[PDB]
Amino acid sequence: PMKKLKLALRLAAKIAPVW
């Protein structure tokens, strides 16, 4: 399966969309 959602969620962990 594709784990793009998991990847994105880990990338967003370091690149935090705060504001």
UniProtKB/TrEMBL annotation:
Domain of life: Bacteria
UniProt keyword terms in alphabetical order: Plasmid
Protein name: MerP protein
Taxonomic source organism: Escherichia coli
